[PDB]
Amino acid sequence: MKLTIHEIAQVVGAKNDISIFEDTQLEKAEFDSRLIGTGDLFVPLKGARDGHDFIETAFENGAAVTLSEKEVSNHPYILVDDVLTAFQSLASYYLEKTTVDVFAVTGSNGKTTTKDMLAHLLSTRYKTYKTQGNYNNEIGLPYTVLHMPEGTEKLVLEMGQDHLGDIHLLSELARPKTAIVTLVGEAHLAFFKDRSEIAKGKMQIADGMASGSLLLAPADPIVEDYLPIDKKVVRFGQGAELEITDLVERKDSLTFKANFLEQALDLPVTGKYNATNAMIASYVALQEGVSEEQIRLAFQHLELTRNRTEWKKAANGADILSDVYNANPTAMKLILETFSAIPANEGGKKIAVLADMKELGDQSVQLHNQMILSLSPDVLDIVIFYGEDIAQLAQLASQMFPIGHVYYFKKTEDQDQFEDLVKQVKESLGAHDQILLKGSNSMNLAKLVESLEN
Numbered sequence: 001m002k003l004t005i006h007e008i009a010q011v012v013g014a015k016n017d018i019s020i021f022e023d024t025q026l027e028k029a030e031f032d033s034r035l036i037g038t039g040d041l042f043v044p045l046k047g048a049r050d051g052h053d054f055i056e057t058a059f060e061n062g063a064a065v066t067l068s069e070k071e072v073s074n075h076p077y078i079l080v081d082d083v084l085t086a087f088q089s090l091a092s093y094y095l096e097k098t099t100v101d102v103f104a105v106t107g108s109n110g111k112t113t114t115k116d117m118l119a120h121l122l123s124t125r126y127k128t129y130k131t132q133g134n135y136n137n138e139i140g141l142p143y144t145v146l147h148m149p150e151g152t153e154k155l156v157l158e159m160g161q162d163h164l165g166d167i168h169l170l171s172e173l174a175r176p177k178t179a180i181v182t183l184v185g186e187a188h189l190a191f192f193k194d195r196s197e198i199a200k201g202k203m204q205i206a207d208g209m210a211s212g213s214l215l216l217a218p219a220d221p222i223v224e225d226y227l228p229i230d231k232k233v234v235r236f237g238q239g240a241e242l243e244i245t246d247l248v249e250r251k252d253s254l255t256f257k258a259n260f261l262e263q264a265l266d267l268p269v270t271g272k273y274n275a276t277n278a279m280i281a282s283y284v285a286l287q288e289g290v291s292e293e294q295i296r297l298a299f300q301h302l303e304l305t306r307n308r309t310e311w312k313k314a315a316n317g318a319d320i321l322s323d324v325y326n327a328n329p330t331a332m333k334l335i336l337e338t339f340s341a342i343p344a345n346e347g348g349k350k351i352a353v354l355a356d357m358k359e360l361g362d363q364s365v366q367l368h369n370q371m372i373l374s375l376s377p378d379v380l381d382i383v384i385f386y387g388e389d390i391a392q393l394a395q396l397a398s399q400m401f402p403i404g405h406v407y408y409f410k411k412t413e414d415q416d417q418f419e420d421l422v423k424q425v426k427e428s429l430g431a432h433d434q435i436l437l438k439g440s441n442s443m444n445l446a447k448l449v450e451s452l453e454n
């Protein structure tokens with residue numbers, strides 16, 4: 001980065017002091033003590049287990065200074081009322097000191113996100129950096145910002161939402177110079193309430209933006225009511241200022257033409273949505289002074305962004321939901337709290353498959369049991385456990401849940417009842433059920449996901 005514990009304290013409001021600590025120039029931030037390095041800034045967040053509980057391991061790992069809501073004794077700490085708020089303010093501040101251009105985008109999608117494409121085009125000319133993975137929430141954005149490489153010219157940030165107001169915060173924090181809203185009214189829209197609201201929330205991407213700023217939004221009527229009053233708005237879709245005049249789809253390729261470009265564009269993916277994303281990514285790419293060719297050239301090669309956490313279907317018209325990345329306690333603890341908000345499909349049955357999360361370290365087993373706090377007999381009807389370190393967690397669930405509502409299958413260097421997990425799951429999973437598969441991606445975990453789908 002480019003900060004100092006003294007500077008940060010100043011920025012956050014170090015309720016303590018700092019004149020006491022050396023004031024060493026920092027290397028970078030981490031909330032995952034297991035990621036901290038020498039001269040880094042530790043930031044203890046409220047995860048599966050509280051972050052503070054890892055401050056000591058932080059320093060043993062390299063921490064130079066640590067954010068904290070309490071006295072740390074014998075270590076450089078910045079005392080604040082709340083770590084996440086402080087972490088946010090630090091990102092907000094950094095964005096002001098970097099004077100880097102921020103491009104906000106809302107709407108992951110799937111194959112190749114508008115976030116990755118827009119970034120891709122901007123790279124051809126400027127040193128750009130983008131939200132890595134799904135770090136598009138109130139923790140990921142500030143993380144992303146601060147992790148920005150030295151001399152970053154264009155920063156493309158993605159902003160997801162779970163509750164109406166989450167994007168208003170993100171926008172207020174990053175102050176996008178430009179923004180894009182792809183939208184797609186959710187189904188069982190967990191936590192949220194309905195399309196019009198989902199639209200009210202994404203449209204908040206504008207709040208932090210300056211007057212006259214370029215905001216791209218769908219032609220879809222459901223946004224009308226929430227258009228900004230003082231921003232330059234461009235609508236995209238059939239009929240709108242920007243529209244796909246022509247599209248052609250091969251078996252696994254695609255070519256489309258945009259009413260503002262003069263030559264079609266090729267994309268190594270298939271979809272009218274990928275088409276719109278690329279189009280909207282380009283229009284913006286142009287505004288930043290990038291030749292239509294550098295673009296057409298750029299799309300030449302892309303980079304499928306491996307699935308992403310989105311619902312799907314097992315040959316059974318069932319509502320799968322395999323999370324392949326983010327193999328950590330907090331991730332699963334949330335991935336659960338969510339999956340257990342959305343009531344059920346048709347019948348009303350809730351299944352949940354869980355397997356070992358590698359690399360949690362020596363405290364792996366202790367870490368898994370922690371999930372027992374996120375498992376409720378009332379909301380979850382059946383819970384299946386696959387793995388080894390997940391064993392004590394299964395035993396705990398079996399004692400908390402109804403008789404027979406839990407299942408456990410072993411998997412080690414000696415055994416692997418994957419065969420039996422298969423069956424059990426098939427038989428257990430009804431054509432009107434929802435099965436959440438979460439946990440480290442393993443060769444087998446992948447196979448099961450397969451069978452389900454066939």
Ligand SMILES: CCN(CC)S(=O)(=O)c1ccc(Cl)c(C(=O)Nc2sc3c(c2C#N)CCC3)c1
Pocket residue numbers: 031032034045046047048049050051134135136137139140326328329330331334359360361367
């Ligand atoms: C990517 C942003 N979020 C998703 C957008 S997140 O859910 O993954 C999210 C948010 C905050 C934290 Cl603190 C974490 C996290 O890494 N927690 C972790 S890793 C690890 C432990 C642990 C805890 N407790 C115990 C030993 C190994 C994750």
